[PDB]
Structure 1
Amino acid sequence: MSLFSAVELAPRDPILGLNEAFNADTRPTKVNLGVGVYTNEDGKIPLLRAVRDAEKARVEAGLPRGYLPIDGIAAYDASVQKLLLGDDSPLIAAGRVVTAQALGGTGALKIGADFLRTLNPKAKVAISDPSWENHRALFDMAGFEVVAYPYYDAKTNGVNFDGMLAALNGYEPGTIVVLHACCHNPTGVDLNDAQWAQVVEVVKARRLVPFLDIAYQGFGESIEADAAAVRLFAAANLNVFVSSSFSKSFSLYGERVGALSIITDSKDEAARVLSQLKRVIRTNYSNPPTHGGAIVAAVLASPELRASWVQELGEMRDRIRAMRNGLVERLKAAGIERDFSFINAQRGMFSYSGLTSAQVDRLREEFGIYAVSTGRICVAALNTRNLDVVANAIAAVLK
């Protein structure tokens, strides 16, 4: 009968079990492919040059640290909109886009979810099959029933687009559809620009609410190309929600730098929407933190710093591609039955390897190489120092 006596232990994230086993493994050569960050060859997170440079310049200014506005640093908010929509967006010019700084991509999703709940608390939320675990968890906690649209096709290592479109073609008006812009998490399987056009047409025709989640702008093809899906929705004169993150693109995970952007029909509608979004932020955490956002805003505003960022993010994009192709080449040379060509078609930090749970267990026990029970691997955790070890271990497990 005490206040907490009925409190249960929360469900364990299945990652915790993987990390526990990895950590207890006394072999000095072990590889964790279950992570969700981009690492360097020492298994550590890089500090980007543009970030280091910006921080060094800013700390010398010794600035006071009063509160930011509820919706964050205005210049940051403006730079985010241009990064997403393009410098010459007519929506920006018409004052139709609302952007609030947020606590990463996660925070943006939350503030969007909470605002959406006030608009129509009977709407359902549709996510990809499968999706980044916190999509379902976040929207369910925000009060929504969550359903999944067909997406990943294990038989083809691609997208079951027919199943996706058929699902969308059955959703009721107001259903919130959570769409990865690119670099699908956790599978790496992405839609092409033509499949995106069909998605936009159905969302429009059925009055669905698209909620784009763009956490990897720059990891797919290019900074500009990776925004394509967001811009297609923008061009369609839809109300669109966009959660964006700089956690990965700036290697700034732990500073919690993202944004929620909403496309509205008018300046007046933008003002009303922002006014309500401010309430939802203020009663959660008042106003956002300064450091991360200030640094991203500084990098984006400086031609030199921005060019350094573009270059480095491109090197990260390209290293992932080199690892993807190196794994494919090696598994081919190894004489494996399974064709791993799909690894080059998948994009971003992850791939669904297609290893069975049994094969993943063998890979761990026999070789100290840790993949997720789903077959997920973080290709961003491969480097020239472990690539051959990993490829040879896979070749061994696959017979």
Structure 2
Amino acid sequence: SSWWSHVEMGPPDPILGVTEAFKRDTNSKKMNLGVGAYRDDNGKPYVLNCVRKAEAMIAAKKMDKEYLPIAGLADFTRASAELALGENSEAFKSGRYVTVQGISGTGSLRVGANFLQRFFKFSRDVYLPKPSWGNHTPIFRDAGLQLQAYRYYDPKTCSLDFTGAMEDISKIPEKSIILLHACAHNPTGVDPRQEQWKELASVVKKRNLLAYFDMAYQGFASGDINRDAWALRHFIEQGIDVVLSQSYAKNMGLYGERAGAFTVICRDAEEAKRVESQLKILIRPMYSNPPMNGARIASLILNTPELRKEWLVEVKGMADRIISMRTQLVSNLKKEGSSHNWQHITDQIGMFCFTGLKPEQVERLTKEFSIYMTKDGRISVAGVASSNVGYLAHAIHQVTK
């Protein structure tokens, strides 16, 4: 009877644990379609060209490794706000915001939840869409908040249940917290249409709710960064002061570098200053100061005109390839003789596809084909290459035949 005799064997993560399982398989034809990580057309990890250059400029400069401020690299911080907000924005222009470097999307999301837990005096509930990224639950839960739900996806029709969302949202108690995915809803790949977003704006405004946006896919929904940030900006411009989390893990392929930011839209710059003081106080005893690498890379790209333009071309390239794989998938399915309607594959946007497969089908896929995906039927289309799209379709067909 030692200290940890009672600690139990916890289970593996529903998403991250897939990669652990995929690693052990000996089948040469294995495919890792669990996590949303982009693969090039050869089915290989892709480090952006602009990233490589940025790295190079950093090396040549013979930079130090000194501790960054608690809030992160200023240059990175101001650049992220700008990327989210837009240069012409009154919020940005007026300096009514505070952005703080975060440990990617998760760390930012968590700093925010913890910030909310500590300063959001009007409520303890966070409303998540149905469904939502698995990780949103434990992030809010460990921070000290309560979880709720609003309707979002309708599996009968493979779309957004707008009537149900509006109903649910219009009943949420005033001053509660609502979580919205900025674009490329994970894992459904279905987003509200702009007119749809306009309507949601009204109700969130009308009910006086704190809108918390999760932006991990800026540039993967349409292949355009300004376009993908529309809703976010529309809310701010309607008078809604949101909070927001950003990730550069996908859009810059900075996965393991862990670069991201958490922002709060305030009333003035003086308010901004005070919010800032408290976020730092919260960050200090968590990890003290953030990791410099990803931040340095991102800043360099965001702040160097030629690198920035290069980056945008690269973002289109990535999105377009994804479209291409979706298209080929459906076509191979038809070719293989599948009867099912696979149109949702091509209707959905972002990195994934919310297929519909039942858990028995998923099991098979892994066992007979060594195709790894999450148990809910979500697959990573982004990790499909010209060379294995055929194997994929054949498997999907076999298991669905």
Does TM, normalized by the shorter one, top 0.5? yes
**Residue 374 of structure 1, CA deviation:** 1.2
- State the SS of the aligned residue for 1:169: helix
C-alpha distance in 2 between matches for 1:18 and 1:245: 21
C-alpha distance in 1 between matches for 2:27 and 2:399: 18
Partner of 2:165: 164
Partner of 1:181: 182
Matches within 5 A, 1:134-283: 134-221=135-222, 222-283=224-285
C-alpha distance in 1 between matches for 2:109 and 2:240: 18
C-alpha distance in 1 between matches for 2:16 and 2:230: 35
Alignment length (residue pairs): 399
C-alpha distance in 2 between matches for 1:18 and 1:295: 29
Match of 2:382 among 380, 383, 398: 380
- State the SS of the aligned residue for 1:248: coil
C-alpha distance in 1 between matches for 2:287 and 2:20: 32
Cα deviations by residue, 1:321-364 (Å, 9 ceiling, x for unpaired): 11111112222344422211111221111111111112222323
Q: What amino acid sits opposite 1:73 in the alignment?
A: L
> Aligned in 2, Cα 1:367/1:2: closer, same or farther, shift over 3 Å?
closer
TM-score, normalised by the number of residues in structure 1? 0.95
Cα deviations by residue, 1:157-187 (Å, 9 ceiling, x for unpaired): 1111222222211111232111111111122
Which range moved further: 65-74 or 108-117? 65-74
Matches within 5 A, 1:281-296: 281-296=283-298
Matches within 5 A, 1:312-351: 312-351=314-353
C-alpha distance in 2 between matches for 1:197 and 1:296: 31
- Whether the aligned pair in 2 keeps the contact of 1:123 and 1:174 (CA below 8 Å) is no
C-alpha distance in 2 between matches for 1:285 and 1:33: 32
**Residue 120 of structure 1, CA deviation:** 3.2
**Residue 232 of structure 1, CA deviation:** 1.1
- Whether the aligned pair in 2 keeps the contact of 1:176 and 1:208 (CA below 8 Å) is yes
C-alpha distance in 1 between matches for 2:16 and 2:312: 34
**Residue 19 of structure 1, CA deviation:** 4.2
- Whether the aligned pair in 1 keeps the contact of 2:42 and 2:386 (CA below 8 Å) is no
Partner of 2:61: 61
> Aligned in 2, Cα 1:14/1:289: closer, same or farther, shift over 3 Å?
closer
Cα deviations by residue, 1:126-167 (Å, 9 ceiling, x for unpaired): 112121111101000000111222112111111112222222
> Aligned in 2, Cα 1:272/1:31: closer, same or farther, shift over 3 Å?
same
**Residue 2 of structure 1, CA deviation:** 4.2
Alignment root-mean-square deviation, CA:
1.7
Partner of 2:79: 79
Where do 5+ consecutive residues of structure 2 fail to align? none
C-alpha distance in 1 between matches for 2:6 and 2:292: 39
C-alpha distance in 2 between matches for 1:20 and 1:263: 39
C-alpha distance in 1 between matches for 2:310 and 2:34: 29
TM-score, normalised by the number of residues in structure 2? 0.95
1:70 matches 2:70: yes
